[PDB]
Design a protein around this ligand. Sequence first.
Ligand SMILES: [Cl-]
Ligand SMILES: [Cl-]
Length: 162
Amino acid sequence: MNIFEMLRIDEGLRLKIYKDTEGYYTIGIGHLLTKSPSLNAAKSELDKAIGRNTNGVITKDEAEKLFNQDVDAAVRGILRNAKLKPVYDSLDCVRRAALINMVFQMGETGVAGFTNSLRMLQQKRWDEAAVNLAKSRWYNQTPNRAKRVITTFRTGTWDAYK
Ligand SMILES: [Cl-]
Ligand SMILES: [Cl-]
């Protein structure tokens, strides 16, 4: 198991523009296109992202390409973030994957706001962090996925993904 497989499980793969859990236009492996309500705006952003007239449909290869770029960008945002970096550097590889997943879902900004949980993870107080992470809109809106990531931080293993 690794970050790619983990997120492929959490996000699925769709080759036609779709709406995510928040109702935003997305495609591929959880690649958000736009928060705008306009399908055209979405098709526009899609073509711009792919470099061709897609007509709202992409290939598997294209999806995987966006995906790789998105993972990369998540890691890179973490490393450039003063609040996140130290946490990330303090964690083992499995838990780093949990932090990346959250950043991929919610953006660096979103995650950097879980101050208390972050401090707990930094301190390696796993059970406490898990309880704190659960008191969040994130958990209440996407409880099954949140549970998986939370179990990952709590245990340091991939059991939730097996
Ligand atoms: Cl892009
Ligand atoms: Cl969920």
